[PDB]
Amino acid sequence: ASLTEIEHLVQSVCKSYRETCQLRLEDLLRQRSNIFSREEVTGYQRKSMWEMWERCAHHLTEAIQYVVEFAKRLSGFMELCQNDQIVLLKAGAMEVVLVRMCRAYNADNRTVFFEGKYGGMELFRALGCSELISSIFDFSHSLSALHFSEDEIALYTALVLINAHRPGLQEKRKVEQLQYNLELAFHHHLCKTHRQSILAKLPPKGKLRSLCSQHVERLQI
Ligand SMILES: CC(=O)N1CCC(C(=O)N2C[C@@H](c3ccc(C(O)(C(F)(F)F)C(F)(F)F)cc3)[C@@](C)(c3ccccc3)C2)CC1
């Protein structure tokens, strides 16, 4: 990787993200006026926690499937050994979904796109996860404040997944090298777009894994 090889990695990560983003950004922004009515919100609140869990678990499964496909398109990831592909997706997929959620979040009214319309955190009252759901919305709010672009999400989430510090890697030197190349690509693309500012404004990695860890615990109770 010299400079044109750095610039090639960027466009490839940004194309792979575009092809697996699940919902187009244009349709998320256009739908910000299609908000759940007061009556539709009550309908969600009256449902059992089990019904809301089956909905959310199946939406989380569909979101994770697109995260796997984004990785399966990453130049480098597909040459790793099967155990390494698995170890990276096991530790990183849920964090990637959390970062990805910021595109579907509207900071103007603290709502998220869910099942066809925008709804506040009150929509998920039946789960009994108000504290966890508040932190999820507050993390998405801190990423939406920065106006996180599609390509920033693409490169940033590629670094969330390609991390050599994951305990269980069989070829930790290969991941470290892919991680190193993605970092040059991310830091270079911030310079090309005059966005160097967002680095110090991004959430600390510990906050992303601590939010993810709490969410993983909720997946049982
Ligand atoms: C129709 C459509 O395309 N949609 C866009 C995607 C959207 C979606 O998947 N959701 C699920 C939705 C969501 C809420 C809550 C959870 C939980 O894990 C649950 F146990 F209930 F399963 C919880 F423990 F946290 F409570 C998972 C997913 C959403 C707000 C969300 C997404 C990602 C991360 C955090 C929250 C939005 C569902 C609607």
Bridge partners (DSSP) of residue 105 are 112
| Cα 60 to middle of ligand 1, angstroms | 6
Q: How many domains does the chain have?
A: 1
Question: d(Cα 127, Cα 53) in Å, to the nearest integer?
Answer: 7
**How many angstroms separate the CA atoms of 71 and 16, rounded?**
8
* Full domain range(s) for residue 127: 1-221
Angle at 60 between CA 58 and CA 63, to 5 degrees: 110
Site to substitute for ligand 1 among 22, 35, 49, 56, most atoms within 8 A of C-beta: 56
What's the rounded Cα separation, in Å, for the pair 102 and 83? 30
**Two structure tokens written together for 127:** 């789960």
What was the elucidation method? X-ray
Indicate if ligand 1 lies below 6 Å from the C-beta of 35.
no
DSSP 177-219: HHHHHHHHHHHHHHHHTT-TTHHHHSPPHHHHHHHHHHHHHHT
- C-alpha span between 164 and 84 (Å, rounded): 10
Please give the number of the atom of ligand 1 that sits closest to the Cα of 60. 9
Cα(138)–Cα(29) distance, integer angstroms: 19
CB neighbours (10 Å) of residue 19? 11
Which residues have C-beta within 8 Å of that of residue 124, sequence separation ≥ 6?
44, 52, 56, 133
Best substitution site from 59, 64, 66, 217 to test ligand 1's pocket, by max atoms within 8 Å of Cβ? 59
- Tell whether the torsion through CA atoms of 85, 88, 90 and 93 is positive or negative: negative
By C-alpha distance, which of 111, 129, 131 is closest to 119?
111
